[PDB]
Amino acid sequence: NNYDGDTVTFSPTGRLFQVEYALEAIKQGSVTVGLRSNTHAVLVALKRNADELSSYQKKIIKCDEHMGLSLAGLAPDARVLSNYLRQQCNYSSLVFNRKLAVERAGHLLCDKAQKNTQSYGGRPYGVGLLIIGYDKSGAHLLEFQPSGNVTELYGTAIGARSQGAKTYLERTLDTFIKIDGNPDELIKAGVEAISQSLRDESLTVDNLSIAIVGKDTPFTIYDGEAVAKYI
Amino acid sequence: MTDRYSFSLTTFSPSGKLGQIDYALTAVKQGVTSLGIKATNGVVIATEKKSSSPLAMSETLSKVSLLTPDIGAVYSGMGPDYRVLVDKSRKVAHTSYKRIYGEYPPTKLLVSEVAKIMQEATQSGGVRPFGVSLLIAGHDEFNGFSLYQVDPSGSYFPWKATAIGKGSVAAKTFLEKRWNDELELEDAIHIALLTLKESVEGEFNGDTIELAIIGDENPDLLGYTGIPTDKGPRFRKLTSQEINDRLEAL
Amino acid sequence: GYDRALSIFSPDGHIFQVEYALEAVKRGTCAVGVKGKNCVVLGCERRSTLKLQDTRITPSKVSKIDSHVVLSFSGLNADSRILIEKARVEAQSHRLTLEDPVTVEYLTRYVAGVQQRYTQSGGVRPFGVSTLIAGFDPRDDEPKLYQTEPSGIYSSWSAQTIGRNSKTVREFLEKNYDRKEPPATVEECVKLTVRSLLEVVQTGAKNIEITVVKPDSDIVALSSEEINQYVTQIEQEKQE
Amino acid sequence: GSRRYDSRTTIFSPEGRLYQVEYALESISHAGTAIGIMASDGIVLAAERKVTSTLLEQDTSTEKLYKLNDKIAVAVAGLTADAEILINTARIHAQNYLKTYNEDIPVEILVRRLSDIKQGYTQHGGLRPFGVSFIYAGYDDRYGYQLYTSNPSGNYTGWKAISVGANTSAAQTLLQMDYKDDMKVDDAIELALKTLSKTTDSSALTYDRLEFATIRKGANDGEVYQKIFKPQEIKDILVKTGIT
Amino acid sequence: QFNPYGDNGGTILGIAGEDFAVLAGDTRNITDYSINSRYEPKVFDCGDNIVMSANGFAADGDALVKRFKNSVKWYHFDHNDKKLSINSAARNIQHLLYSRRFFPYYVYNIIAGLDEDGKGAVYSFDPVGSYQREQCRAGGAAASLIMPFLDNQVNFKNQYEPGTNGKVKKPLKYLSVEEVIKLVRDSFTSATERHIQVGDGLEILIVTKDGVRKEFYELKRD
Amino acid sequence: DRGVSTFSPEGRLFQVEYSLEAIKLGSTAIGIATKEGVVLGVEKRATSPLLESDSIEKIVEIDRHIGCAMSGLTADARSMIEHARTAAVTHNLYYDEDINVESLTQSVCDLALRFGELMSRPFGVALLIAGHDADDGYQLFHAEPSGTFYRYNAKAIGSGSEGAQAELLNEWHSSLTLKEAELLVLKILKQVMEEKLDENNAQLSCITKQDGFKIYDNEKTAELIKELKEKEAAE
Amino acid sequence: TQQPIVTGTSVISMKYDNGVIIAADNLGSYGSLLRFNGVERLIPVGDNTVVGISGDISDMQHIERLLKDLVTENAYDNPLADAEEALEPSYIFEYLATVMYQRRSKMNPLWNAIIVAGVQSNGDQFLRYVNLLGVTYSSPTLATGFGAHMANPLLRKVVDRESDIPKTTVQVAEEAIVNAMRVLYYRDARSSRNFSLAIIDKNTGLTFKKNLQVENMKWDFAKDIKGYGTQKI
Amino acid sequence: TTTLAFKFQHGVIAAVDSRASAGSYISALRVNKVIEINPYLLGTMSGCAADCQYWERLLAKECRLYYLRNGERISVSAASKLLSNMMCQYRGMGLSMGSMICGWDKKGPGLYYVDEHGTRLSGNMFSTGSGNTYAYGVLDSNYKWDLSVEDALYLGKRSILAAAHRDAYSGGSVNLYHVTEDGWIYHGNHDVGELFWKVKEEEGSFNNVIG
Ligand SMILES: [Mg+2]
Ligand SMILES: [Mg+2]
Structure with missing residues (x-):
């Protein structure tokens, strides 16, 4: 109200409204789902078009051979944050001959977002990210909020109507975690999860975007006829 | 962090007034009375040592300050602002003059440097004006004795005699009746003490009054002998006893 | 440094500072530009509220940017000097690095770029100035006349006016200027420029300035008497 | 943050005016009147000190008329402290020019330079403008005797006769009435003092309330002399012209 | 005084075939008269069907290769996983080298692969960035021993057709990958005999449309 | 007042949303x-x-294989065009090749x-970036001041955009x-x-693989306008 | 640009079937003066790596602190710091090699020659060299300074190529290393009798041996050597 | 190295050798010492090959940007100047560059010599490199403005041959270029070994050499 003019101002109840408004931009964004087993981690994203002449906005970005994310909210902010991850993954490889741990990648994103919430002049990032990766401790899935909060999960969803997919994954938890050494079945569970967030529209060939990373699987994105198999 | 106040805090109002300067002058008005009188062979500056507490040692608080051996200053208004201005004035006398010309600046030019500093606090970014009016008395070879007033705006005027602060209006009227162009230094001191008594409520003695003069060279205060051309400072602060002696002939 | 964003969008999609800069131009004295077949004429209004003026030394309204290009303006006088100085420096910088003088279009594009830059840089306000830039490209006999404004847009004009009551003189130029047959001579071009200012000026005395620019760096400013002869001839034909 | 307290000194009004420049001009309209009159054989600068005191040391005082170099002087109207900042800058510019070209700076070039500095404060920096209007009186071998004025906007113009400060409307009308082109310095001296005497807000015009200066080729042969009038000399010229 | 440069010896050789390319180099690493390693790989697969070797000062060679490999990675990121053509890689390397014009990478560099028409390609660089496409290029310590031999046996220089006596040149018939590898092995075996910095082992990387293949051969260890 | 980079309660940047209103007036x-x-x-x-209409330059060449059209505060487009031309030519310098249309747009x-408190405000102009490369063929992008770019089969921007877009919805097919x-x-x-549309108040241009980017002559466009009038009168 | 002041001589090492061995004497020379006799030049990093350093000792102590800080930093926000995300020999080496090359590129080197010896997560032997120029190389045997000239020839007689590594036991490897250290003591004027030896084995882990001495020396034949040619007495 | 270029009736000829040496060792028999800045501009190269390649390819970037901004082809005078100003930035740093900027613009055919010093000279004929003195002799004695394209091409070709023969660091092959108002035209690569014997026989020159 009087306390939402900038990110540097707490409300009387201790809230940060600019951060909450940035969180609101994610809710307006298109749905994306993340889930993993012990061998693989999967991202599924519902891409959004402007109209029938337009392309469908890409949702998934590769950060390294073993890591990548999906976005929901302001796409340019995802490009900035993903570029930062690319650099950090790359710094780890060049200097330490070491693949960047997914947990450490989350810590770096948290700290980068945090600086934008405590300083004058700047603004919070207006995007949410779901980071998947496979490192020395196996498969991982992270959820990033532009408040700075990063959370390691078995599965999750962000964007509009994401609650439906999140409830589904909460029911299916015991099943999909056990899908080891079967990439196609893990993707199926993700496609079925994101289907719980659809209304009026359904998953078409240029609508659906899928990514996967695992034990002997580099981070690879599937679009177009490559996802027709799962429709 | 960083000083993000890079804009002026003093600005012209629709009527053409610079508010912060006017308000700085109001702070000066509330300040304790100080005055200056110029004689033929000297200048006197004086003020009341308004002690905040009787437990405070008012000798440790110097309202009258030496700027150069031949220049002294007194103020009315905010004491802390005055103290830092004295520090800057002493330094600028060296950096912008003595280290260049090998001699101390003349009164009018040191006043000009102090005035410039005060003007800049009226226009520069993220600062308020100084809440003081200064009375600067001094002597130099080619201009002789002089007395200047410097206001929060940075404007300065030369005076034969004047007063600033609390009872300045009444004090200036008192000085107009008594001043002439034939006054000797002792006559000016006498008039200073008379004028200052009117604005003082409580105790009026050497311990509650601060008074200094710009007069003859004091070779006894130089600290060394052997150089004929060096004859000592013209600035001298009168002692508590020296003031009381002149209060008996009052 | 002072970084405050002064030029910003409003809910209706307007940059008010840029639009208020145009209001400063509206207040400025009238300037007019007319290009003939082999020349360009720049006319300028001088408000007669200021007499006791020394016209020898008072900043003239038309300024040479190079030997072959001139610039006139309407709006804040002090603002215009900054644009003129920058333009003059760029003109010499071009001759030095490219070994050709600037084209009129290039010089216009530069000045317009400076104006634009001051509409989305922090800590600065837009120029309260619109300019008319005229001249001839090196080794070219085609007349050139351009206009710039605070927003930074620029365009070429057969004839144009800016400043106070420019609406009225543009009205005149739109009905009097024929594109198929522009003022064939210097006389006709100057006459049409003076006529256009007489719709707005008041007295045709020292209120009208005229500067003629011809090809190959041939630039001259008309005197009071020369202009007065045009003023005389115009009204004598009008008494009919 | 800090934005909250920013007055924004460099913005247009909806009408296309610069608030701070307009308000600075309002400030200057309360300053003592300064007048400049250009003649064929010299220039006169006359200015009124503001409500003075009897205890003010006039002979060492300077609030209106300042020397920029041997050929150029200025009359001030507005904040004296602001003026001195600009004056010292102008003095340096004149010396820079002299060092570079080994010739005295032409009057207009100095005027343009100071006027550009004023302009800058109205367009960038976020600082308040200088609340000062100058009358420049000077001589060079190109245009001879010249009068200029500059105000807080950074706009400058040339004049045959001009006033700044208080009652400029009344003063300019009086100058416009009695000024002629073939006028001489001694006549201009009289016109300036007569104009001040009629426009002044004081009861009577006296020597202690005035500063006076002339720039004359009344220097022995082809050269120019600046004369800042002493208090006694202002008293004499007041008697000569028949005002006191 | 500190000398930031050194010489790690080694010799490399790149030959462009009709539809293939080879980049070979010995595996010996040295300082002065000592051997550091008998097997220290010098020719690398940089991705996108491009092979590379920076011969000379090993520290600068390892840095340049590391940077180019990185440039390939970012080319994919920035341009939608587009394949970096051999000619584009060559131009990119020029700019990597010339960024140190006033403190150069002390290496002679060679890359090999296939052009956009599927033909064999070899590009050669100097330490400061000048480059050009070539058919045959030996670089490093024993470059002067090998190149004259290749001029003779690859481009058939100074060879004429019997009976004509210098009137008709020997025709420039294309060489097979098996033929090129023989010339490579004989080049290095000969260099090993007369150059002390050459020996220990020979590693060859062959580039075709099918991908990158490696071949290793022993050399004399004295 | 309020920050330039401020979010609204709905999760949108005020300044970006306001610049979109300026583009609607273009x-x-x-x-x-x-x-x-x-x-x-x-539309000129x-x-x-x-005003000499041929000096109105709202269609611009970025490279031989990329063209660009603008709508809104067109003065803001000049630095964007300069950057685009520099990016296109610089990539050719570094990589000895044409740059991808998407990469240029990005x-x-x-x-x-x-922008913030960098420039003081977003751009007040939208761009239609059209071009061709070997990887993705003929492409049309819509670059906004939000930093978002959509690829389009057909797109209209400016004051008559929603009416035009509805018309493009019906008319466009993949065999045009x-x-x-x-x-x-x-x-x-x-x-x-x-x-009323004519060759002086409207301008055409195209990008083909063979001939690259070309702005159409007024004589060439005038013939296409006459061809249009006749085919509309044909039924 | 500097010059080394207090210096450490040869560091020698070799691979064997189940791990690596590394050794270095305990001397810190000050030119020809054998000034400091209790200097440890083998620095363990965790339980899988030992970094052996020769050259300037003040720079060695700096590197020692970098490695100590590296371990601290790796543990930050790292639940698997003593498991899957523990420091590897290859991580430690690449970090040092990055630092060494950066420092030489600023013309302010760390005046050292370093050998990183260790065993990787997968049980692979790690042995790589880096020096003040940022030059790196790997070999079955590695040695710095004099060790390069005298130790390598002896150690290469045991492991001449990669295929000899599985055939070489820890007893044979240690014996060869210990003999090499004796030879260096005979022939290097900047060597000491006291040394340290470290074994990093994939089964038995890190064994660090301090206060070792060169023994079984041959000197008796010196009694028969008289004069420099013709002298009989 | 030997490079030359000269202006004549129907444009400008540009001829260069092809050798590169590392001391006495011939590192390259075939380097391209002409840089195709654009279809209307050429640059020869002497000095450091890297400096020539880098700065002249960067000049091409500036010349292309010029055309996009101004909608007009850059002049040879302006192009040569942009290049000379780049050199003046690294004045004293150690760049080594000597090149002739060849082209055709509004003022007709144009030829400018530019070097690392920042020198920029307009002229009808230039030659640089270790063998330039030999080339100048053939050029000066046979050059006319009235030359045909055929004869001019041979002149530049013959002048390089003269240098290739005598100068130890010049040889390999000759590259010819002809610059017209419609752009430059490449006239092939000519082996010096084969060209020498050919010219010796046809022309009768080089009598002292036994063939
Ligand atoms: Mg050998
Ligand atoms: Mg030769």
Whole structure:
């Protein structure tokens, strides 16, 4: 109200409204789902078009051979944050001959977002990210909020109507975690999860975007006829 | 962090007034009375040592300050602002003059440097004006004795005699009746003490009054002998006893 | 440094500072530009509220940017000097690095770029100035006349006016200027420029300035008497 | 943050005016009147000190008329402290020019330079403008005797006769009435003092309330002399012209 | 005084075939008269069907290769996983080298692969960035021993057709990958005999449309 | 007042949303992508008859294989064009090749959100970037001041955009020829323009693989307008 | 640019079937003065790596602190710091090699020659060299300074190529290393009798041996050597 | 190295050798010492090959940007100047560059010599490199403005041959270029070994050499 003019101002109840408004931009964004087993981690994203002449906005970005994310909210902010991850993954490889741990990648994103919430002049990032990766401790899935909060999960969803997919994954938890050494079945569970967030529209060939990373699987994105198999 | 106040805090109002300067002058008005009188062979500056507490040692608080051996200053208004201005004035006398010309600046030019500093606090970014009016008395070879007033705006005027602060209006009227162009230094001191008594409520003695003069060279205060051309400072602060002696002939 | 964003969008999609800069131009004295077949004429209004003026030394309204290009303006006088100085420096910088003088279009594009830059840089306000830039490209006999404004847009004009009551003189130029047959001579071009200012000026005395620019760096400013002869001839034909 | 307290000194009004420049001009309209009159054989600068005191040391005082170099002087109207900042800058510019070209700076070039500095404060920096209007009186071998004025906007113009400060409307009308082109310095001296005497807000015009200066080729042969009038000399010229 | 440069010896050789390319180099690493390693790989697969070797000062060679490999990675990121053509890689390397014009990478560099028409390609660089496409290029310590031999046996220089006596040149018939590898092995075996910095082992990387293949051969260890 | 980079309660940047309103006031620009080329067309909208209309430059070459049309505060586009031309030529310097249309567009869009308290405000202009490369063929992009860019088969921006976009919705199909696209741009421009469309107040351009980016002569466009009038009178 | 002041001589090492061995004497020379006799030049990093350093000792102590800080930093926000995300020999080496090359590129080197010896997570032997120029190389045997000239020839007689590594036991490897250290003591004027030896084995882990001495020396034949040619007495 | 270029009736000829040496060792028999800045501009190269390649390819970037901004082809005078100003930035740093900027613009055919010093000279004929003195002799004695394209091409070709023969660091092959108002035209690569014997026989020159 009087306390939402900038990110540097707490409300009387201790809230940060600019951060909450940035969180609101994610809710307006298109749905994306993340889930993993012990061998693989999967991202599924519902891409959004402007109209029938337009392309469908890409949702998934590769950060390294073993890591990548999906976005929901302001796409340019995802490009900035993903570029930062690319650099950090790359710094780890060049200097330490070491693949960047997914947990450490989350810590770096948290700290980068945090600086934008405590300083004058700047603004919070207006995007949410779901980071998947496979490192020395196996498969991982992270959820990033532009408040700075990063959370390691078995599965999750962000964007509009994401609650439906999140409830589904909460029911299916015991099943999909056990899908080891079967990439196609893990993707199926993700496609079925994101289907719980659809209304009026359904998953078409240029609508659906899928990514996967695992034990002997580099981070690879599937679009177009490559996802027709799962429709 | 960083000083993000890079804009002026003093600005012209629709009527053409610079508010912060006017308000700085109001702070000066509330300040304790100080005055200056110029004689033929000297200048006197004086003020009341308004002690905040009787437990405070008012000798440790110097309202009258030496700027150069031949220049002294007194103020009315905010004491802390005055103290830092004295520090800057002493330094600028060296950096912008003595280290260049090998001699101390003349009164009018040191006043000009102090005035410039005060003007800049009226226009520069993220600062308020100084809440003081200064009375600067001094002597130099080619201009002789002089007395200047410097206001929060940075404007300065030369005076034969004047007063600033609390009872300045009444004090200036008192000085107009008594001043002439034939006054000797002792006559000016006498008039200073008379004028200052009117604005003082409580105790009026050497311990509650601060008074200094710009007069003859004091070779006894130089600290060394052997150089004929060096004859000592013209600035001298009168002692508590020296003031009381002149209060008996009052 | 002072970084405050002064030029910003409003809910209706307007940059008010840029639009208020145009209001400063509206207040400025009238300037007019007319290009003939082999020349360009720049006319300028001088408000007669200021007499006791020394016209020898008072900043003239038309300024040479190079030997072959001139610039006139309407709006804040002090603002215009900054644009003129920058333009003059760029003109010499071009001759030095490219070994050709600037084209009129290039010089216009530069000045317009400076104006634009001051509409989305922090800590600065837009120029309260619109300019008319005229001249001839090196080794070219085609007349050139351009206009710039605070927003930074620029365009070429057969004839144009800016400043106070420019609406009225543009009205005149739109009905009097024929594109198929522009003022064939210097006389006709100057006459049409003076006529256009007489719709707005008041007295045709020292209120009208005229500067003629011809090809190959041939630039001259008309005197009071020369202009007065045009003023005389115009009204004598009008008494009919 | 800090934005909250920013007055924004460099913005247009909806009408296309610069608030701070307009308000600075309002400030200057309360300053003592300064007048400049250009003649064929010299220039006169006359200015009124503001409500003075009897205890003010006039002979060492300077609030209106300042020397920029041997050929150029200025009359001030507005904040004296602001003026001195600009004056010292102008003095340096004149010396820079002299060092570079080994010739005295032409009057207009100095005027343009100071006027550009004023302009800058109205367009960038976020600082308040200088609340000062100058009358420049000077001589060079190109245009001879010249009068200029500059105000807080950074706009400058040339004049045959001009006033700044208080009652400029009344003063300019009086100058416009009695000024002629073939006028001489001694006549201009009289016109300036007569104009001040009629426009002044004081009861009577006296020597202690005035500063006076002339720039004359009344220097022995082809050269120019600046004369800042002493208090006694202002008293004499007041008697000569028949005002006191 | 500190000398930031050194010489790690080694010799490399790149030959462009009709539809293939080879980049070979010995595996010996040295300082002065000592051997550091008998097997220290010098020719690398940089991705996108491009092979590379920076011969000379090993520290600068390892840095340049590391940077180019990185440039390939970012080319994919920035341009939608587009394949970096051999000619584009060559131009990119020029700019990597010339960024140190006033403190150069002390290496002679060679890359090999296939052009956009599927033909064999070899590009050669100097330490400061000048480059050009070539058919045959030996670089490093024993470059002067090998190149004259290749001029003779690859481009058939100074060879004429019997009976004509210098009137008709020997025709420039294309060489097979098996033929090129023989010339490579004989080049290095000969260099090993007369150059002390050459020996220990020979590693060859062959580039075709099918991908990158490696071949290793022993050399004399004295 | 309030920050320039402030979020609204709805989760939108005020300044970006307000710049979109400025673009709505701009003159109409239309782009249509086909397998034979991409056509770009604009409404010139001269404010006066004395303004020489051929000096109105709202269609611009970025490279031989990339063109661009603008709508809104067109003065803001100049630095965007300069950056685009530099990016295109610089990539050719570094990589000895043409730059991808998407990569060029992405490079332009990176400038967009570089504003705050960098430039003091977003751009007040939208761009239609049309081009061809070997990897993705003929492409049309819509670059906004939000930093977002959508690829389009056909797109209209400016004051008559929603009316034109509805028309493009019905008319576009994947088998359009270059000639059919040209007439289609002219038809829709004529529909949404205030003044009567002719060769002087409207401009056409195209990008083909063979000939690259070309702005059409007024004589060439005049013939296409006459061809349009006759085919509309044909039924 | 500097010059080394207090210096450490040869560091020698070799691979064997199940791990690596590394050794270095305990001397810190000050030119020809054998100034400091209790200097440890083998620095363990965790339980899988030992970094052996020769050259300037003040720079060695700096590197020692970098490695100590590296371990601290790796543990930060790292639940698997003593498991899957523990420091590897290859991580430690690449970090040092990055630092060494950066420092030489600023013309302010760390005046050292370093050998990183260790065993990787997968049980692979790690042995690589880096020096003040940023030059790196790997070999079955590695040695710095004099060790390069005298130790390598002896150690290469045991492991001449990669295929000899599985055939070489820890007893044979240690014996060869210990003999090499004796030879260096005979022939290097900047060597000491006291040394340290470290064994990093994939089964038995890190064994660090301090206060070792060169023994079984041959000197008796010296009694028969008289004069420099013709002298009989 | 030997490079030359000269202006004549129907444009400008540009001829260069092809050798590169590392001391006495011939590192390259075939380097391209002409840089195709654009279809209307040429640059020869002497000095450091890297400096020539880098700065002249960067000049091409500036010349292309010029055309996009101004909608007009850059002049030879302006192009040569942009290049000379780049050199003046690294004045004293150690760049080594000597090149002739060849082209055709509004003022007709144009030829400018530019070097690392920042020198920029307009002229009808230039030659640089270790063998330039030999080339100048053939050029000066046979050059006319009235030359045909055929004869001019041979002159530049013959002048390089003269240098290739005598100068130890010049040889390999000759590259010819002809610059017209419609752009430059490449006239092939000519082996010096084969060209020498050919010219010796046909022309009768080089009598002292036994063939
Ligand atoms: Mg050998
Ligand atoms: Mg030769």
